[PDB]
Design a protein around this motif. Structure first.
Motif, PDB file in Angstrom:
ATOM      1  N   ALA A 147       0.824  -1.197   0.000  1.00 55.43           N
ATOM      2  CA  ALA A 147       0.000   0.000   0.000  1.00 55.43           C
ATOM      3  C   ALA A 147       0.860   1.249   0.000  1.00 55.43           C
ATOM      4  O   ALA A 147       2.001   1.244   0.457  1.00 55.43           O
ATOM      5  CB  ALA A 147      -0.919  -0.001   1.195  1.00 55.43           C
ATOM      6  N   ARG A 148       0.219   2.329  -0.442  1.00 58.44           N
ATOM      7  CA  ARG A 148       0.778   3.671  -0.507  1.00 58.44           C
ATOM      8  C   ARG A 148       1.664   3.990   0.699  1.00 58.44           C
ATOM      9  O   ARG A 148       2.809   4.431   0.515  1.00 58.44           O
ATOM     10  CB  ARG A 148      -0.356   4.689  -0.670  1.00 58.44           C
ATOM     11  CG  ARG A 148       0.045   6.132  -0.381  1.00 58.44           C
ATOM     12  CD  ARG A 148      -1.037   7.137  -0.710  1.00 58.44           C
ATOM     13  NE  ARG A 148      -2.182   7.045   0.199  1.00 58.44           N
ATOM     14  CZ  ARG A 148      -3.363   7.635  -0.008  1.00 58.44           C
ATOM     15  NH1 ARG A 148      -3.650   8.217  -1.164  1.00 58.44           N
ATOM     16  NH2 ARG A 148      -4.275   7.610   0.953  1.00 58.44           N
ATOM     17  N   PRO A 149       1.145   3.935   1.947  1.00 60.40           N
ATOM     18  CA  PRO A 149       1.976   4.241   3.111  1.00 60.40           C
ATOM     19  C   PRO A 149       3.164   3.297   3.318  1.00 60.40           C
ATOM     20  O   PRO A 149       4.141   3.661   3.977  1.00 60.40           O
ATOM     21  CB  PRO A 149       0.982   4.162   4.272  1.00 60.40           C
ATOM     22  CG  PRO A 149      -0.096   3.255   3.762  1.00 60.40           C
ATOM     23  CD  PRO A 149      -0.250   3.613   2.299  1.00 60.40           C
ATOM     24  N   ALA A 206      -7.692  18.028   4.005  1.00 61.46           N
ATOM     25  CA  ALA A 206      -8.466  16.910   4.524  1.00 61.46           C
ATOM     26  C   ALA A 206      -8.134  15.609   3.770  1.00 61.46           C
ATOM     27  O   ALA A 206      -8.146  15.580   2.556  1.00 61.46           O
ATOM     28  CB  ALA A 206      -9.960  17.239   4.411  1.00 61.46           C
ATOM     29  N   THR A 207      -7.889  14.516   4.500  1.00 62.20           N
ATOM     30  CA  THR A 207      -7.988  13.152   3.944  1.00 62.20           C
ATOM     31  C   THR A 207      -8.832  12.286   4.881  1.00 62.20           C
ATOM     32  O   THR A 207      -8.644  12.303   6.110  1.00 62.20           O
ATOM     33  CB  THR A 207      -6.628  12.453   3.738  1.00 62.20           C
ATOM     34  OG1 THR A 207      -5.998  12.177   4.993  1.00 62.20           O
ATOM     35  CG2 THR A 207      -5.678  13.267   2.877  1.00 62.20           C
ATOM     36  N   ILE A 208      -9.683  11.446   4.282  1.00 63.45           N
ATOM     37  CA  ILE A 208     -10.584  10.587   5.035  1.00 63.45           C
ATOM     38  C   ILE A 208     -10.681   9.274   4.275  1.00 63.45           C
ATOM     39  O   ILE A 208     -11.120   9.299   3.128  1.00 63.45           O
ATOM     40  CB  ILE A 208     -11.977  11.222   5.194  1.00 63.45           C
ATOM     41  CG1 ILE A 208     -11.938  12.572   5.898  1.00 63.45           C
ATOM     42  CG2 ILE A 208     -12.952  10.288   5.903  1.00 63.45           C
ATOM     43  CD1 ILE A 208     -11.606  12.449   7.368  1.00 63.45           C
ATOM     44  N   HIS A 209     -10.251   8.148   4.884  1.00 59.63           N
ATOM     45  CA  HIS A 209     -10.524   6.860   4.247  1.00 59.63           C
ATOM     46  C   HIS A 209     -10.684   5.677   5.205  1.00 59.63           C
ATOM     47  O   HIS A 209     -10.766   4.548   4.719  1.00 59.63           O
ATOM     48  CB  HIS A 209      -9.431   6.513   3.219  1.00 59.63           C
ATOM     49  CG  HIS A 209      -8.114   6.186   3.820  1.00 59.63           C
ATOM     50  ND1 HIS A 209      -7.644   4.891   4.039  1.00 59.63           N
ATOM     51  CD2 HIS A 209      -7.239   7.002   4.343  1.00 59.63           C
ATOM     52  CE1 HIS A 209      -6.454   4.973   4.600  1.00 59.63           C
ATOM     53  NE2 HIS A 209      -6.186   6.264   4.776  1.00 59.63           N
ATOM     54  N   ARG A 210     -10.699   5.874   6.524  1.00 59.47           N
ATOM     55  CA  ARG A 210     -10.885   4.733   7.414  1.00 59.47           C
ATOM     56  C   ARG A 210     -12.217   4.045   7.070  1.00 59.47           C
ATOM     57  O   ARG A 210     -13.220   4.719   6.889  1.00 59.47           O
ATOM     58  CB  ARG A 210     -10.894   5.141   8.891  1.00 59.47           C
ATOM     59  CG  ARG A 210      -9.596   5.713   9.462  1.00 59.47           C
ATOM     60  CD  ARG A 210      -8.707   4.679  10.151  1.00 59.47           C
ATOM     61  NE  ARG A 210      -8.133   3.751   9.164  1.00 59.47           N
ATOM     62  CZ  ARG A 210      -7.057   3.999   8.399  1.00 59.47           C
ATOM     63  NH1 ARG A 210      -6.545   5.233   8.301  1.00 59.47           N
ATOM     64  NH2 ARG A 210      -6.436   2.982   7.833  1.00 59.47           N
ATOM     65  N   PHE A 221      -9.038  18.403  -0.611  1.00 55.73           N
ATOM     66  CA  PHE A 221      -9.469  17.085  -0.184  1.00 55.73           C
ATOM     67  C   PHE A 221      -9.099  16.110  -1.286  1.00 55.73           C
ATOM     68  O   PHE A 221      -9.890  15.871  -2.195  1.00 55.73           O
ATOM     69  CB  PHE A 221     -10.976  17.096   0.108  1.00 55.73           C
ATOM     70  CG  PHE A 221     -11.601  15.840   0.667  1.00 55.73           C
ATOM     71  CD1 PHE A 221     -10.841  14.723   1.022  1.00 55.73           C
ATOM     72  CD2 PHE A 221     -12.966  15.796   0.904  1.00 55.73           C
ATOM     73  CE1 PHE A 221     -11.441  13.591   1.554  1.00 55.73           C
ATOM     74  CE2 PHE A 221     -13.561  14.654   1.427  1.00 55.73           C
ATOM     75  CZ  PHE A 221     -12.796  13.563   1.761  1.00 55.73           C
ATOM     76  N   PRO A 222      -7.876  15.552  -1.275  1.00 54.73           N
ATOM     77  CA  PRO A 222      -7.538  14.434  -2.146  1.00 54.73           C
ATOM     78  C   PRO A 222      -8.346  13.260  -1.608  1.00 54.73           C
ATOM     79  O   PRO A 222      -8.188  12.872  -0.458  1.00 54.73           O
ATOM     80  CB  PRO A 222      -6.021  14.259  -1.968  1.00 54.73           C
ATOM     81  CG  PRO A 222      -5.581  15.478  -1.207  1.00 54.73           C
ATOM     82  CD  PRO A 222      -6.776  15.871  -0.369  1.00 54.73           C
ATOM     83  N   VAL A 223      -9.234  12.723  -2.429  1.00 52.48           N
ATOM     84  CA  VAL A 223     -10.205  11.759  -1.953  1.00 52.48           C
ATOM     85  C   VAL A 223      -9.720  10.358  -2.285  1.00 52.48           C
ATOM     86  O   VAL A 223      -9.535  10.032  -3.445  1.00 52.48           O
ATOM     87  CB  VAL A 223     -11.571  12.040  -2.581  1.00 52.48           C
ATOM     88  CG1 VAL A 223     -12.632  11.047  -2.131  1.00 52.48           C
ATOM     89  CG2 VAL A 223     -12.011  13.470  -2.305  1.00 52.48           C
ATOM     90  N   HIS A 224      -9.515   9.535  -1.251  1.00 55.90           N
ATOM     91  CA  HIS A 224      -9.194   8.139  -1.468  1.00 55.90           C
ATOM     92  C   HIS A 224     -10.235   7.526  -2.397  1.00 55.90           C
ATOM     93  O   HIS A 224     -11.414   7.879  -2.316  1.00 55.90           O
ATOM     94  CB  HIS A 224      -9.148   7.433  -0.121  1.00 55.90           C
ATOM     95  CG  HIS A 224      -8.657   6.023  -0.119  1.00 55.90           C
ATOM     96  ND1 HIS A 224      -9.419   4.960  -0.549  1.00 55.90           N
ATOM     97  CD2 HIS A 224      -7.515   5.493   0.388  1.00 55.90           C
ATOM     98  CE1 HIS A 224      -8.715   3.838  -0.368  1.00 55.90           C
ATOM     99  NE2 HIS A 224      -7.583   4.140   0.250  1.00 55.90           N
ATOM    100  N   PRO A 225      -9.853   6.565  -3.276  1.00 55.80           N
ATOM    101  CA  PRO A 225     -10.811   5.961  -4.206  1.00 55.80           C
ATOM    102  C   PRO A 225     -12.014   5.271  -3.552  1.00 55.80           C
ATOM    103  O   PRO A 225     -13.107   5.316  -4.109  1.00 55.80           O
ATOM    104  CB  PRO A 225      -9.958   4.956  -4.989  1.00 55.80           C
ATOM    105  CG  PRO A 225      -8.736   4.707  -4.138  1.00 55.80           C
ATOM    106  CD  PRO A 225      -8.500   6.005  -3.414  1.00 55.80           C
TER     107      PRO A 225
END
Ligand SMILES: CC(=O)N[C@H]1[C@@H](OP(=O)(O)OP(=O)(O)OC[C@H]2O[C@@H](n3ccc(=O)[nH]c3=O)[C@H](O)[C@@H]2O)O[C@H](C(=O)O)[C@@H](O)[C@@H]1NC(C)=O
Ligand SMILES: CC(=O)N[C@H]1[C@@H](OP(=O)(O)OP(=O)(O)OC[C@H]2O[C@@H](n3ccc(=O)[nH]c3=O)[C@H](O)[C@@H]2O)O[C@H](C(=O)O)[C@@H](O)[C@@H]1NC(C)=O
Ligand SMILES: O=c1ccn([C@@H]2O[C@H](COP(=O)(O)OP(=O)(O)O)[C@@H](O)[C@H]2O)c(=O)[nH]1
Ligand SMILES: O=c1ccn([C@@H]2O[C@H](COP(=O)(O)OP(=O)(O)O)[C@@H](O)[C@H]2O)c(=O)[nH]1
Ligand SMILES: [Cl-]
Ligand SMILES: [Cl-]
Lengths: 360, 362
Positions: free
Chosen positions: A10-12, A204-208, A236-240
């Motif tokens: 994954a990315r991280p 902002a990032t939100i993906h949990r 807000f880069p939005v996770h897919p």
């Protein structure tokens, strides 16, 4: 001559491995073999990281992704094992706490190959969370535990893991921020492309899963960010997955009311983070990176694994229960700051790890 | 009212499941689903237990077995997840510490289905054992931990597992021995068949990976059993992995120097153990069963999880470093007895387990 095989999915993990890989590269008598599980596959989630962070092409790409926990983990277990049988590494390094991490660890321990966990010992203390199970099971399967924080060290001791297998080394993602900062500075034109003023926006990032799989939490968050946007633009880069869920629940219009983007590369991310007046996130990496740049942070969760950010007053929990409450919390926190304090080490976590491996 | 899905794969898991399943069938507001992973597939390793121990046919047979850790565990994980997404049980029960155990736990935990581990908290402190990994990770994936011994309770507490998820229930394999003992005596003709009297032989089983995957270790064992056989007949039901390793290594001829058998069913096994003068094994269950019948035991391993047997002097470790020494150890221990002591509970571990599964709560 020691062979260190890194499993990333994954990315991280691409970002962690970029720091550790650099050091192992220029280490005498080390060959690194790098396995990409395929967990993250989109160019904006994977390839942009190998390019911008100058990460050697993987020796293997297993191309496993987008399935169930069972499917992804199961297939990764068989595929990684096949590679370990061919490559016979001296060490397997796994990173973070995805299914990729766990499949790497478990493939390796059954073959009597030593496993080291990069970012070991973090706990949310909410065992319903897939990521907590992944952390616990990875830690208990590993031989070496590379802890980023004292809390993480204490969490491992409390679960019966001996002192002599735990090394407090700081955080490799701090190493990465340090190493790549200049390159971000000279290559990223995202403020330009977005017509943003330095310190003229909130990031902002939100993906949990627990925030995006639950319609009412996700609605509280998108409503809250649109409100916040009335006052100060929200980038807000939005996770897919987040974007999938918001579309699916009919909340897509909230994304239109802020400056929503597809996911960005690390160099843009650094520039957006650094220049943000405040960061709202449910990301582990992003809440630390906020602190890197002394940008106040709001974490949209009931807990964090990175408790020292809350103690140092750099980070603040706002569970997404009420859109107005959360909006006001974000707006209030953007004129706050935390105490002077060095967390996460000196930026040489990756060489402390290199050293401990080539010794042990 | 509550759906409880068991995952089993191997011989010792069918015996454990036999004991628990009997109870769960009596319990009102309890439906069972049994998933047989396919880990053990030969009739003398699977079917015979279902038939003699009176277990209903599995609801699902995944037919996975014979591969690497990677292949077996991986395919079991994906397969079991499929079943669980269909059946959506309230609990998943896993037993012991095979690849099947772990795949069952991992499937379940990521679906937020509560996992209970029957036979929880045992530790060899030897991670080279795949089985050690399987029970550490299963335990840490479990919401309920059914520990057979105080050592096992202490092992779990030492690894940060809360007291309220741990219950010392004893060992369902003692329940099994107790419940099936009359049937074994009534039906087994193994002694007649082999031409053995009581106390006229030694019983052997060997199948640990660390004992069979190494040519010269296995030679040490087979040679030691050949030697023992000259002084007291040795009866040796041979595990298929063990026979296969013995063949591939060219050690087959040693099995002619003892009374080598194919795997026997549980009823014949009881009669063999009960009437043996000494049991020598690297099995977990066989160690305990040897104590159940007050027969001295020699464990051919560098350690056991069942440490209370060593302290009560019913068991004695003899790592296979040298054939003459292992032979002499075996023959020497034949004349020994342990101390009178009750272990493994009261033969109603299954009932305690059923009770906890029902009353644990949402
Ligand atoms: C809560 C949780 O379990 N989290 C675990 C999870 O990480 P995480 O939540 O940080 O995921 P994530 O936000 O996608 O990535 C952040 C990075 O992406 C960059 N990032 C972010 C957005 C973007 O558009 N572009 C970009 O470059 C950022 O600049 C930043 O560098 O997977 C990690 C892993 O397995 O290694 C675990 O270490 C984490 N465990 C912990 C404890 O933090
Ligand atoms: C060393 C180790 O990890 N062992 C684990 C392992 O068991 P185990 O080593 O006892 O395998 P095993 O000897 O094939 O079966 C014995 C049974 O077969 C019967 N048995 C034996 C031979 C025979 O011919 N006929 C017969 O009926 C015997 O009468 C007896 O009832 O898998 C088990 C499982 O996951 O459930 C774990 O609980 C174990 N963990 C422990 C700690 O004992
Ligand atoms: O390159 C990628 C990676 C992930 N995803 C989406 O994000 C979801 C979550 O994937 P992830 O691997 O992050 O799972 P987690 O670690 O959160 O369990 C996937 O099912 C996909 O829908 C995607 O669209 N593209
Ligand atoms: O019914 C069975 C089960 C197993 N095996 C053999 O025993 C090996 C080991 O099986 P497994 O991986 O389940 O481990 P074990 O039974 O030795 O604990 C398998 O690969 C097969 O070669 C067999 O011949 N018949
Ligand atoms: Cl994100
Ligand atoms: Cl056996």
């Amino acid at each position: 001559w020691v062979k260190i095989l890194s499993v990333v999915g994954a990315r991280p993990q691409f970002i962690k491995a970029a720091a550790v890989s650099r050091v192992l590269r220029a280490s005498p008598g080390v060959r690194e073999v790098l396995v990409h599980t395929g967990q993250h596959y989109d160019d904006n989630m994977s390839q942009v990281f190998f390019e911008e962070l100058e990460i050697p092409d993987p020796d293997y790409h297993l191309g496993i992704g987008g399935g169930t926990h069972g499917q992804n983990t199961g297939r990764m277990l068989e595929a990684i094992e096949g590679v370990l049988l061919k490559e016979k590494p001296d060490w397997v390094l796994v990173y973070g706490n995805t299914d990729s991490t766990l499949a790497g660890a478990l493939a390796a321990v059954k073959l009597h190959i030593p496993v080291a966990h990069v970012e070991a010992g973090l706990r949310s203390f909410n065992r319903r969370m897939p990521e907590e199970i992944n952390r616990i099971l990875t830690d208990h399967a590993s031989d070496l535990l590379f802890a980023p924080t004292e809390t993480a060290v204490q969490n491992l001791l409390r679960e019966g893991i001996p002192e002599n297998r735990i090394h407090l080394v700081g955080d490799v993602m701090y190493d990465a921020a340090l190493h790549y900062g200049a390159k971000a500075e000279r290559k990223s034109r995202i403020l330009e492309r977005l017509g943003l003023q330095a310190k003229g926006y909130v990031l902002a990032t939100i993906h949990r899963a627990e925030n995006t799989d639950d319609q009412e939490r996700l609605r509280v968050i998108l409503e809250a960010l649109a409100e916040v946007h009335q006052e100060v633009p929200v980038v807000f880069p939005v996770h897919p997955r987040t974007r999938k869920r918001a579309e699916a629940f009919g909340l897509g219009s909230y994304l239109e009311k802020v400056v929503a983007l597809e996911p960005v590369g690390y160099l843009d991310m650094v520039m957006l983070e650094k220049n943000a007046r405040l960061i709202v996130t449910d990301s582990g990496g992003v809440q630390k990176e906020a602190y890197f740049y002394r940008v106040p942070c709001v974490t949209v969760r009931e807990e964090t694994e990175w408790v020292e950010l809350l103690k140092a007053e750099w980070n603040y929990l706002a569970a997404p229960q009420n859109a107005k409450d959360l909006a006001l919390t974000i707006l209030h926190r953007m004129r706050t700051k935390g105490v002077e304090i060095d967390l996460y080490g000196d930026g040489r976590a990756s060489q402390k790890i290199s050293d401990f491996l080539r010794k042990v």
